[PDB]
UniProtKB/Swiss-Prot annotation, chain A:
Residues 1-110 form the PCI domain. Acts as a regulatory subunit of the 26S proteasome which is involved in the ATP-dependent degradation of ubiquitinated proteins. Transmembrane segments: none annotated. The chain holds residues 298 to 442 of 445 of the full protein. Belongs to the proteasome subunit p55 family. N-acetylated by NAT1. It comes from Saccharomyces cerevisiae (strain ATCC 204508 / S288c) (Baker's yeast). This is 26S proteasome regulatory subunit RPN5. Present with 5710 molecules/cell in log phase SD medium. It comes from the Eukaryota.
UniProtKB/Swiss-Prot annotation, chain B:
Belongs to the proteasome subunit S11 family. This is 26S proteasome regulatory subunit RPN9. Residues 1-158 form the PCI domain. Acts as a regulatory subunit of the 26S proteasome which is involved in the ATP-dependent degradation of ubiquitinated proteins. The gene is RPN9. GO terms for molecular function: structural molecule activity. Keywords: Proteasome. The keyword Nucleus does not apply. One of its GO terms (biological process) is proteasome-mediated ubiquitin-dependent protein catabolic process. It comes from the Eukaryota. The keyword S-adenosyl-L-methionine does not apply. It comes from Saccharomyces cerevisiae (strain ATCC 204508 / S288c) (Baker's yeast).
Swiss-Prot record, chain C:
It comes from Saccharomyces cerevisiae (strain ATCC 204508 / S288c). It comes from the Eukaryota. GO terms for biological process: proteasome-mediated ubiquitin-dependent protein catabolic process; ubiquitin-dependent protein catabolic process. N-acetylated by NAT1. This is 26S proteasome regulatory subunit RPN8. The keyword Acetylation applies.
Curated annotation (Swiss-Prot), chain E:
Component of the lid subcomplex of the 26S proteasome, a multiprotein complex involved in the ATP-dependent degradation of ubiquitinated proteins. RPN11 is the only catalytically active member of the lid and serves as the essential deubiquitinase of the proteasome. The chain holds residues 205 to 306 of 306 of the full protein. The keyword Protease applies. One of its GO terms (biological process) is mitochondrial fission. The JAMM motif is required for the deubiquitination and degradation of ubiquitinated substrates. It comes from the Eukaryota. N-acetylated by NAT3. It comes from Saccharomyces cerevisiae (strain ATCC 204508 / S288c) (Baker's yeast). GO terms for molecular function: cysteine-type deubiquitinase activity; metal ion binding; metal-dependent deubiquitinase activity; metallopeptidase activity; proteasome binding. GO terms for cellular component: cytosol; mitochondrion; nucleus; proteasome complex; proteasome regulatory particle, lid subcomplex; proteasome storage granule. This is Ubiquitin carboxyl-terminal hydrolase RPN11.
Amino acid sequence: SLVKLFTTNELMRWPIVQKTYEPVLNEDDLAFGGEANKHHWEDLQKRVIEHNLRVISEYYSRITLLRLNELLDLTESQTETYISDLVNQGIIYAKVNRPAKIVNFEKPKNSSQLLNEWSHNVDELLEHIETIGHLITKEEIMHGL
Amino acid sequence: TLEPSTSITLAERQQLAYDLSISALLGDKIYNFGELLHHPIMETIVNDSNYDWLFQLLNALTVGDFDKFDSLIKVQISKIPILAQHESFLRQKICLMTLIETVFVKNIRMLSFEDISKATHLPKDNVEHLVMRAISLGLLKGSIDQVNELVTISWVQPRIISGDQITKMKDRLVEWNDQVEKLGKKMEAR
Amino acid sequence: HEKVTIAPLVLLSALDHYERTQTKENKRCVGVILGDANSSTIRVTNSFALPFEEDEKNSDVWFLDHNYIENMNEMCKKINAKEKLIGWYHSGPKLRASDLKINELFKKYTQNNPLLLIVDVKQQGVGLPTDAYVAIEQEKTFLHLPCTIEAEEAEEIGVEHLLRIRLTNQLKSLKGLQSKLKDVVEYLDKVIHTILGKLQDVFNLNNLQKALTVKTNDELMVIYISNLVRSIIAFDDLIENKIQNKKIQEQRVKD
Amino acid sequence: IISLTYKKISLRDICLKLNLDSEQTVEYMVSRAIRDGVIEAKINHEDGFIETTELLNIYDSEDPQ
Amino acid sequence: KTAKETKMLMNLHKEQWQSGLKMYDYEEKEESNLAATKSMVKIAEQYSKRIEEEKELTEEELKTRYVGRQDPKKHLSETADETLENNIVSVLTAGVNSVAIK
Amino acid sequence: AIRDEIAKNTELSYDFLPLSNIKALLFFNNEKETEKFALERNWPIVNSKVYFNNQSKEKADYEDEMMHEEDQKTNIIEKAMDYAISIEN
């Protein structure tokens, strides 16, 4: 479930699952080097935030920055910190308006509008004759038999 | 739907529908309880002895009362929250089927948050979280408008239902035929 | 799915079988085709006929002889060895008991799925008088396959000797939209669900179009760039005869 | 000339330039202007200045077409 | 040829076979095929200029210098269909019939 | 005729007119003269304000292919594109 947790992660139950079942998570004495358990909370929390911003861009296209801080488990200063890191590293892309406090998806305009995006309607005009050709044949089978 | 195959007695049809009653509880896939209404399944069984679970949740989508179905079941299937989570989808899915042709004849697809809030028995703050869980699990595809609070969906699985549905779909083809007498007659003469 | 490519000779000779004998609506002719069914694109390089007898008043009465096919296949072995039986064709739109049962007799000499062809002898409406269908089960379900017309180099050249833009599509587009309205009305009387469920999803593909109007005029403005070329073409049309017009006054002095 | 150079200009600032009569007089000369769509502006009395209504960005409209 | 042979050959082989869908002939090819045909139309308009620049830039003297004669008419007929095809799809653009009205 | 043309600038463009200020603009000796002028001009009257709801003009007999039609507007665009085709052919 931790692998599939990346699909839906609100970070609301994230500290609860780690404190309940912690075989390798919070306290791990096997196959992990370190001087203390402080590396378990730091390394695990920074990675789940990176996977958090990836799926949110594919779900919420436009969201207010005020309500965004509660879903990402971040503050006003911590929100723009992880956003700028993923853009500089070539991970994801988004829209951040400081004065407007509005976070959008920044939809690319390079699709040439009706030259590409509109071509998705070819399945609408194509399936018309396919249903008619199947209907005429189907009506004659039940009528003759 | 198969008439010639699966030849069984009347007593085995109730036990066959018993597995169909528990199959549509925890998941929404392949239409809804209304699909078995057209097939000779729900009409061939008895409405008592806990065989009405297909009938109860069919009308419970518009009513929105969970206590009616909870009183007719046991504690085993009522202790799982998944039953109440996926039931609210079919309440919205009925509203989702209205985004093609239902009211507006201008081919304008619009769904607000208030129409799905009272039908699904869910508050306003959980509307945004409900859409995220639907797309993530592969239930539906599309996007929503968080500014004007509107919903515009993508390809779905419309049911076999008829009447008011086919009535609005045939009226659109009339508009295609009315444009033949408008734009078509002008291009034919020119 | 698969594909079906039928040569123009097969579709041309199949319609001729109806007129020669002046067949009425009580009889329907059946014939066979040849080609290669191994690939995904069915190619029909040959066609024949069969002495098929059928009763119109009784769907349980049909006569088909497979011995005539055996003597015919032995003749093709001395002619073309690559020609094998890929299926069969029948005449008339109606599918009755006699047409559905005889499909299994041709499966004995055909390794792959025999191709199903419904020939329209009255050629009424649209194009493609003979539709290509495939037999598959989940009750036999006949699905429509893409029909393409492609022939060899020598066959396509010989047809040109026999016969020796925007408005064209609009004339056929108006009758297509009206025919789709009748298919829904006629299907309604047959019920009083399968096709209606598919059509509602296909039809699903101005709330979000408020800001999508700008891109419409943006494409029209790029078209106007070609209209500026048309103006340049019109400017070049003005240069053409001036070459001739100035030579007119030059001939006045010579003559 | 003064409307294109100043998008938002006070009512008393125009009379100081052309040496007009009074602010009541200059307000009604702009009246005859935009009736036919010459200046294409608006007069806000409560705010106390004349604002130009032209935002340009007319390339995306159908008027040039 | 007979009556049945005349109408059958015209629906099979005449020039090129677009048939089998009559309403989808110029509807599918001039609209849904823009991705494989007119995609990046801004660059396609630059191709019309390169054809005119290949000719008009050579001989402007209407004589034999750069060895050309019909150069103004070489790009005239070639770019005439490009404007024509752009005018056809322009009509078919509104011919999609999105059912807008109000 | 003069006083009408003076007040026509605030009609079709300017939205909400004041109350006591219009008295000094049009040279009114009484405050009630402002509302009396709006009666002949057929303007809505609210508290300390005067709105204009007539910005959208309609009716006026029938109009075909003029001033931004609806169904006939598409034909005008199609006719303009067909003029260049008929001349080329």
